[PDB]
């Protein structure tokens, strides 16, 4: 009978087998819909979570209370060095779904890509794709390869580009690269195939994939928490202080007579390390990295045309548990799944942005680069040492 007081469902049943993710990267699982009227472009990218900071911008929202006033918003920094396209896969759609027809790889694949192909690079002979690049440099193999290209052109409906990240530009311990299939959209199959084989063996920047102040989706693996109980895992109400065999339980699991524990009651188990797909993450800024023209320059990072300083995106003491960003970055609005150093699939949206919350051009006033390793109170080393004057070690120096 009749639970006597209405309360909604604890947790969502659209998210469960609430188990560890089978992948570490983050599968797209749905690319944007193709229309051949658009130009040829990519639809996703692969970045790494560096850290968080906050910004100051001036809002242009007519009718809102914060119209033409300055707000502070948290941002997430994703380091995105350019991805190397090294392969291309084609798909044909069948009444059983959509199967891969033919892959073609490139000559001279890099060692971090082959590191992805091996489970123990130390004890291996590193023999992967050697007989393949043999048939690339050959001439009997060469006519075979263009025959495969022509067959792919006349039969495939969906082409995708296999691209890897280049981990030698990152502050991480991992030297093994991340590969990814990124769907190519906007054209005929012949057009996108010659476009992709033009881009073969080559670098693609996030400047070319994404743009300023558009809304994208972030796909990743939620931060891992381990084996948790029902109070942490499902946020059920804690039982009163005088409960004999434990407080952090669910007091009743189903009635007598469905005679089984249902799949919809709260149980203890794995929390976190979950594959999630969050949408409507607004890009605030695309960085530019550490270029060398002369005695080099890093203002092309967080110099915001209203401070004109010479600071990078990096805080004092660097990004905690990550390192420092020396590559192209992407600043997103808000929080994003995963730990620091976690690889994030970033992809184009598959809705249409007609919203005044969306379609909005932003303009940053300030980017906070105080130290996140404490309650840091200085933006730059020059500002800190000019505020403090000479120290004892500086004096003896």
């Amino acid at each position: 009978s009749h639970r006597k007081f209405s309360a909604p469902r604890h947790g969502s049943l659209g998210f469960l087998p609430r188990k560890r993710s089978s992948r570490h990267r983050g599968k797209v699982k749905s690319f944007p819909k193709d229309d051949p009227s658009k130009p040829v472009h990519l639809t996703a990218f692969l970045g790494y979570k560096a850290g968080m900071t906050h910004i100051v911008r001036e809002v242009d929202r007519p009718g809102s209370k914060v119209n033409k006033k300055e707000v502070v918003e948290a941002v997430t920094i994703v380091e995105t060095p350019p991805m190397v396209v090294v392969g291309i896969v084609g798909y044909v759609e069948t009444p059983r779904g959509l199967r891969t027809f033919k892959t073609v790889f490139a000559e001279h694949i890099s060692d971090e890509c082959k590191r992805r192909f091996y489970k123990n690079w130390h004890k291996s002979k590193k023999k992967a794709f050697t007989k393949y690049c043999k048939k690339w440099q050959d001439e009997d193999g060469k006519k075979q390869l263009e025959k495969d290209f022509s067959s792919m052109k006349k039969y495939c409906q969906v082409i995708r580009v296999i691209a890897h990240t280049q981990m030698r530009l990152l502050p991480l311990r991992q030297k093994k690269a991340h590969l990814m299939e990124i769907q190519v959209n906007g054209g005929t199959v012949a057009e996108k195939l010659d476009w992709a084989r033009e881009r073969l063996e080559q670098q693609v920047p996030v400047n070319q994939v994404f743009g300023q102040d558009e809304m994208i989706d972030v796909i990743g693996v939620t931060k891992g928490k381990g084996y948790k109980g029902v109070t942490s895992r499902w946020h059920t109400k804690k039982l009163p202080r005088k409960t004999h065999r434990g407080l952090r339980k669910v007091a009743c699991i189903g009635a007598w007579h469905p005679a089984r524990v249902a799949f919809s009651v709260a149980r203890a188990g794995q929390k976190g390390y979950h594959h999630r797909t969050e949408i409507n993450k607004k890009i605030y800024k695309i960085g530019q990295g550490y270029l060398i023209k002369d005695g080099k320059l890093i203002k092309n990072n967080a110099s915001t045309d209203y401070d004109l300083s010479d600071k990078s995106i990096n805080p004092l003491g660097g990004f905690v548990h990550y390192g420092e960003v020396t590559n192209d970055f992407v600043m997103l609005k808000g929080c994003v799944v995963g730990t620091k150093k976690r690889v994030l699939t970033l992809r184009k949206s598959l809705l249409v942005q007609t919203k005044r919350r969306a379609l909005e051009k932003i303009d940053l006033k300030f980017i906070d680069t105080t130290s996140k390793f404490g309650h840091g109170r200085f933006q730059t080393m020059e500002e800190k040492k000019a505020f403090m004057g000479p120290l004892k070690k500086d004096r003896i120096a």
Binding site: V56, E70, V72, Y306, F366, D368, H375, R377, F387, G389
Partner: protein, 62 residues
């Protein structure tokens, strides 16, 4: 992007940090962190706390 000065320590409070304390007398105060906040509410003298700008300007450390 207005930068305020901490009421207890006299440091620069950048626009995302610290807290602001309005008293019943209409006077408001800005604190860089909870160290300065707790010293203020415990009514310590910033000219007696060694690491403050008021202390260093009184003792001519500049």
């Amino acid at each position: 992007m207005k930068v305020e000065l901490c009421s207890f320590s006299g440091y620069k409070i950048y626009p995302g940090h610290g807290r602001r304390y309005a008293r019943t007398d209409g006077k408001v105060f800005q604190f860089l962190n909870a160290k300065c906040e707790s010293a203020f509410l415990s009514k310590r003298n910033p000219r007696q706390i060694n690491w403050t700008v008021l202390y260093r300007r009184k003792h001519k450390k500049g």
